[PDB]
Design a binder for these strands. Structure first.
Ligand SMILES: Nc1ncnc2c1ncn2[C@@H]1O[C@H](COP(=O)(O)OP(=O)(O)O)[C@@H](O)[C@H]1O
Ligand SMILES: [Mg+2]
Length: 729
DNA sequence: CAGCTCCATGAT
DNA sequence: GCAGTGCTCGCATGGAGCTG
DNA sequence: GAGCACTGC
């Protein structure tokens, strides 16, 4: 917990921003005259040395202090009057406004134009994916080491990079065996504090190059020098005046070759230059609305801020920007739908009331909602693009079927789409035996079907009472007709379009097995007016998920021999490292019923194979290619992911999903190797996560969206709304 | 199994 | 394009988690 | 000293 907790601690008092900060916290709650007066005592830092800033302030701190000796109203206008000025202040002072000129040059150079960079660095730098120069901005720091704050000498906190100050009087160098030692030492006045260097002599020069002045030293502390008194190693001792080395300064990815001090001076010398050249992107009317910097400065800020406030204002600008890009394209779609327009219709509680009472089980207040929502949106004078989202076995299917009656019941006909012929056939059965009948004629049209039959069908649709067609994105590729088509159901990712009747829009509905938390929903997809998400069905018991060490792997192996001997089946997934084949017939020392599926060898008659698994031809399987949310092998009691977490926390879900059906009270182990905490911190979490959305919650908070590549927004969301509003035009 | 990075140590 | 100043910044090794 | 800019031939 050490690091993750110490700098954190000694990080509140003593620097304008922190100050301003707190004061805002001050008001947003309650002053404390007393207090202020003690914050001001602790202030320290170069920013303050501005006249107004100082004058400007008094005025301020003076206005505030009055709060308390003030009844209710007397307090308000008082407050907002403030708050406004802080931000007012912050904007004035806290940012290093990049005042620009000379003139822009602007392309993708092969980076040698870069200054300081040269041949070998050329190659070095490209190990970081840095060609071009745009390449040299879109490349922001790992992190930031700050400094501004200077520690006193004799308060060195045992074991920590600090930056203290003082003279320096002592340049000794010591040689031993396979080691030297360079020392000079720093003298506040009273204290004197060893400051030691290892296999560097040069330093000798500089330090001597120096003896005289007082300076700023930046290093670490060490609990040794068993003679006592702490010893500071590794520092930097810059001559000084450092109003200008009492700054935040970045930390970039490195690459044997370069050094921070290197890489830095290299950003130090170009960024200001480049930044400057960037045609603004979003219009000035916006900017003004919400208040964070154009670009130049923003990009500026990500490298060389002087207020974490800066940096904040910089991501914030830099991130809204790129959500804009999305929500722009969205409406820009959503609108085009407003053109072509949609169609509604009336609806007979008849059907559903029937369907619903027909079933055995209950229904959920969830699916109920799925329902109230679909109807209504279909009904509405325009399109519907809902997303029926849920978690394998939540009741997605049912619901779809109501969509299917309601639409039929209305007047028009629906058209089910699905990635695979094998899946079509299979779905078909259900919608019918499901529809168990009433009075609806539903088809499939899959190319397997005999040419005539096709014909009898096609024609069936061109006119009349073929009520639903079940097929692949086969339909759309041949060019079918029917002059009423009131909806299109979809299952999932079909490889790699919308439908219009005469010219209006077709009620579109898309179901998915792999959840996605609302923000991500509303941010990469959003355009799917909604997602009526599911909260799950009863009687439903769930996978006893277990996590198992390796070695004991032959343990699980056996557990199957059983369950599988008692008539069940077992997946076995092994990522990438041929071994597979080696993993295979060494696994027919599990002699018994095995099948393979290399995977991305990806004919998507993968199901071809699963069918055959579900039918009972490969007692057990063998992965690679994380199997998908598809044809469902019933008997499959147990699952086995190995050397995981290479798998997102979701593919694993996928996998867990795939095994259970029945009640079957299925089971899924996961062999592990070594790895650790953060890794297993996660797994551990998986296993007890009854619920696959709090999964995504959790996949986000930890690894950024693995599911090209977002530069900037790690869930704060006021943006994703800041969007909707500004984000029409 | 390897190739790289990042971090912490190295001296009586 | 190579040859001569004059800058800035320069340890090395070993175990470490990470991705391929 | 490595790497690079910059100046000159
Ligand atoms: N309300 C319910 N209560 C109990 N079982 C239900 C309920 N709704 C659906 N089921 C059944 O439980 C399983 C749910 O999965 P399903 O409805 O096929 O959709 P999906 O797997 O896509 O979520 C099916 O057997 C379905 O028939
Ligand atoms: Mg389904």
């Amino acid at each position: 917990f050490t690091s993750s907790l110490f700098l954190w601690g000694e990080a509140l008092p003593t620097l304008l921003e922190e100050f301003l900060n707190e004061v805002e916290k001050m008001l947003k709650n309650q002053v404390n005259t007393r207090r202020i007066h003690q914050l001001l005592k602790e202030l320290d830092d170069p920013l303050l040395e501005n006249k107004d800033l100082e004058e400007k302030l008094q005025a301020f701190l003076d206005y505030v202090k009055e709060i308390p000796n003030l009844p209710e109203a007397r307090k308000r206008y008082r407050i907002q009057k403030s708050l406004e000025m802080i931000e007012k202040l912050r904007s004035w002072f806290l940012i290093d406004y990049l005042e620009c000129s000379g003139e822009e040059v602007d392309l993708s150079t092969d980076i040698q134009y870069a200054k300081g960079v040269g041949p070998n660095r050329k190659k070095k730098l490209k190990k970081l994916g840095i060609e071009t120069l745009r390449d040299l901005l879109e490349f922001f720091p790992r992190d930031y080491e700050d400094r501004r704050k200077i520690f006193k000498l004799n308060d060195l906190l045992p074991g920590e990079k600090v930056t203290t100050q003082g003279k320096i009087v002592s340049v000794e160098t010591k040689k031993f065996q396979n080691m030297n030692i360079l020392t000079a030492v720093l003298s506040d006045g009273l204290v004197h504090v060893p400051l030691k260097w290892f296999n560097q002599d040069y330093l000798q020069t500089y330090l001597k190059q120096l003896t005289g002045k007082e300076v700023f030293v930046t290093g670490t502390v060490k609990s040794n020098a068993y003679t006592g008194q702490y010893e500071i190693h590794n520092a930097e001792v810059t001559p000084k005046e450092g109003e200008y080395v009492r700054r935040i300064l970045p930390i970039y990815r490195l690459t044997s070759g370069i050094s921070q001090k290197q890489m830095r001076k290299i950003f130090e010398e170009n960024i200001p230059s480049l930044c400057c050249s960037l045609k603004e992107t979003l219009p000035e009317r916006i900017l003004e609305k919400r208040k964070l910097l154009g670009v130049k400065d923003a990009y500026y800020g990500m490298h060389f801020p002087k207020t974490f406030y800066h940096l904040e204002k910089a991501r914030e600008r830099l991130a809204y920007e790129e959500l804009f890009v999305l929500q722009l394209a969205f409406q820009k779609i959503r609108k085009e739908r407003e053109k072509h327009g949609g169609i509604p219709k009336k609806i007979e509680g008849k059907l559903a009331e029937e369907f619903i009472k027909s079933l055995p089980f209950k229904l959920t207040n969830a699916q109920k909602r799925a329902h109230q929502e679909i109807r209504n949106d279909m009904i509405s004078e325009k399109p519907m693009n809902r997303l029926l989202q849920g978690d394998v076995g939540s009741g997605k299917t049912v619901v779809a079927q109501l969509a299917i009656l309601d639409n039929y019941e209305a007047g028009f006909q629906t058209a089910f789409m699905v990635p695979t012929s094998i899946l079509a056939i299979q779905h078909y059965r259900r919608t019918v035996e499901s529809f168990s009948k009433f009075n609806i004629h539903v088809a499939l049209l899959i190319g397997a079907t005999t040419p005539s039959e096709k014909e009898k069908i096609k024609s069936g649709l061109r006119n009349g009472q073929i009520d639903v067609v079940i097929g692949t994105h086969a339909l759309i590729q041949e060019d079918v007709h029917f002059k009423n088509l009131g909806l299109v159901i979809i299952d999932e990712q079909h490889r790699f379009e919308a439908l219009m009747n005469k010219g209006k829009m077709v009620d579109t509905l898309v179901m998915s097995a792999t959840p996605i938390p609302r923000s991500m929903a509303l941010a990469f997809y959003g355009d799917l007016d909604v997602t009526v998400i599911d909260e799950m069905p009863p009687g439903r018991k769930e996978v006893q998920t277990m996590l198992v060490p390796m070695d004991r792997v032959n343990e699980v192996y056996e557990f199957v021999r059983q369950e599988v001997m008692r008539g069940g089946q077992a997946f076995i997934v092994y990522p990438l490292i041929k071994s597979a084949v080696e993993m295979y017939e060494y696994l027919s020392k599990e002699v018994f019923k095995l099948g393979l599926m290399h995977g991305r060898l990806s004919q998507e008659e993968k199901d071809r194979v699963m069918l055959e698994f579900a039918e009972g031809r490969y007692d057990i399987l063998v992965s690679t290619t994380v199997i998908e949310v598809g044809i469902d092998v019933p008997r499959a009691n147990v699952m086995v992911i190995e050397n995981p977490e290479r798998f997102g926390l979701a593919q694993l879900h996928q996998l867990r999903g795939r095994v259970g059906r029945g009640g079957q009270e299925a089971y899924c182990f996961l062999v592990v190797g070594d790895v650790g905490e953060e890794a297993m911190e996660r797994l551990r979490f998986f296993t007890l996560n009854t619920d696959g959305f709090k999964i995504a919650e959790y996949d986000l908070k930890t690894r950024g969206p693995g599911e090209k590549q977002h530069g900037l927004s790690g869930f704060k969301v006021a943006d994703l709304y800041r969007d909707l509003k500004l984000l029409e035009w």
